[PDB]
Amino acid sequence: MRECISIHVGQAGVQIGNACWELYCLEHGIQPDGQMPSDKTIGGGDDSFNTFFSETGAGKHVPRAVFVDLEPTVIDEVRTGTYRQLFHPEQLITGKEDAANNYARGHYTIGKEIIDLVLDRIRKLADQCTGLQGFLVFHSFGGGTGSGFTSLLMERLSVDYGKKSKLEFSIYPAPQVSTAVVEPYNSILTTHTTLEHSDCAFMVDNEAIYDICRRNLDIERPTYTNLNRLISQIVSSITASLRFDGALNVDLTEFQTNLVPYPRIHFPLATYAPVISAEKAYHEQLSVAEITNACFEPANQMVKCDPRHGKYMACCLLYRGDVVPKDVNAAIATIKTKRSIQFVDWCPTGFKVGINYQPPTVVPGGDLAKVQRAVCMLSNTTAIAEAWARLDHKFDLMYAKRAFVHWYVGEGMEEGEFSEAREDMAALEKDYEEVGVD
């Protein structure tokens, strides 16, 4: 058994981390006090769920997680929340002045002051690992800590742990829930600095999560808690293969080899179904072919783009609940009849499929209904480059006039890092084009 360490950076990263860990505990049967009645290996074990949970002699199960934010408002609600006793105060790290939605301030000014303490506390968790896989990093693109400090930590993790794999879960900025005008700048600057250190990054556009919550859960103005509860679902179905017995994506390395044939194009599109509101008296279950077919509708994607106008290079199907391989191959065959699914010449037209018999777990009181079969699709389609085109254009409009740039220079960044980062994503947008376009 090989371990994974999760790192939660900034407000978004932490609040999403705390929704993921609550969901993990319900899925594995761990209580708020870290006690696992189903666990008969006391104070130890090489079970696959031990990839995410340590174990004390007293029988507590501790997340292999570190939370870091440069202001304490958010992490302290973890210290006082219903899962407070899950963590050791040494896994939670606070500044007192945050990055003020300023990449340069989280990366250069404040990141320099705190990066070495975060690495120490990470190292203490890595010390008790018999064979570390790598890290899953949760953060936002728009925040100053999420963008600025995250990219600095990835640079340092690539040397302190040069061989380990690094996976990202990144929140792409959406104006309907965004906190700052500068989020396009922070997104581009951190993507450029982080790109050659990330092995595989699953980006969630808050816009898509927002309108799913509106349309399918009938929440008229979704909150972060509503967004995070759905986000945790998709995250859990992606990490389930690391925490449960199986033979697909059992190692962080498999994510890259199965989904990322091109190192720079390491941004898989996630699509999830079914998202059904829990208060609707009830619904008649959907087929395997129906939720599988929902995975090709843009209204269910974590990022709103049109895969029909690009090419796939890989596709995984992660089912949970009452599903068997017969019904899957039937849905796939019939779905390739009616859908535009064009792979690249250089790759086979195929689907890797995983099934876990445990139906999806839902949080009590949440807005999502207990289903008995769900599916998450991971497809590496060039269509996700539409998200880079949107951001790059917003970046361009403001930067042509140097709007807000003085806030970054004032922190010691040079104007040239702006042009450098923008030229990188210009290349990336073109790389995406040569692959998926004729």
């Binding site: 843009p298 209204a299 709103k304 049109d306 859908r339 535009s340 539409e386 085109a389 949107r390 254009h393």
Partner: protein, 351 residues
Amino acid sequence: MYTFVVRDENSSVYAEVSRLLLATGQWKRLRKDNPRFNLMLGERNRLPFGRLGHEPGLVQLVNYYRGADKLCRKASLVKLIKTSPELSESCTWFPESYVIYPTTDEREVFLAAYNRRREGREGNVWIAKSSAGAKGEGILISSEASELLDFIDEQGQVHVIQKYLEKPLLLEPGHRKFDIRSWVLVDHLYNIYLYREGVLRTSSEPYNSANFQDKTCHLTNHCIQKEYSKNYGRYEEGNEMFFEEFNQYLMDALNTTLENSILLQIKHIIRSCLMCIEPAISTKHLHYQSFQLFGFDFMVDEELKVWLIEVNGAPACAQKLYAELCQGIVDVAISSVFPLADTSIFIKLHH
């Protein structure tokens, strides 16, 4: 009120649609890159489809279908025809055609059938075309394959070669060739609307079987007959004959209708072309919605068989009909999504 932007200012059709929307009193025009628009009358090349449908609180509409290029360009159309089961490489209404690149390429395909009919001494006059050429240039006809792709390796753009219509229906008086242009509007619901009024764009010099040299007996394009033509304008003004008079000619001269004799074939070719790509370009459940106006180009042989020769995704109208069509665009494609305050000119082709 509603907002819209104009990003191809040299479009005759949507130049007039813009003018009619402003006369509404319910539409205001922002400029190029104001993103807070309801409707985008977009550019022809590299229109940013990825930036549409991402403005909170605004239903957005664009006058182009992402992906309609695979049908509106020659190389793409032939690949579409031959590789789509719905449309068959044995397609009856599309002329024998082959994609061939200068200097995936059907050039040895092409002369296999060339010699096959030389063996049978059947008609062996082909034609080579491209998307880059215009002005009746980058176009050539001849009987011997040898120097017609001696002629396109002479260029560096992809060109197609296509069996030439050697026995076309020829108007009299004149003994002259012609094309038929039909305008079709696909709205956001993918209703296929056919403009009741077409036009025959005509040649004004008798069709000369004997030599392909001078391309004014051969190429019915509006401009070459306006530009290298003695009698451009004699029989009909502007070499534009419209359906009412063409109908009367076929009746008087061959005892048949237009609707019967030709239109049923046109409507069938349109349905087949656009339903074949619906799964690939429909915006039914997309964050933005599309409509688009196409111009189909058909030719008719002597047996009253209709042939499709190309589809135009950014078409121009005929001067007599700009008013009627352009307002039909507003009522069916624009005011369909953006209602205004308070018979028909299209043929719906069901599906």
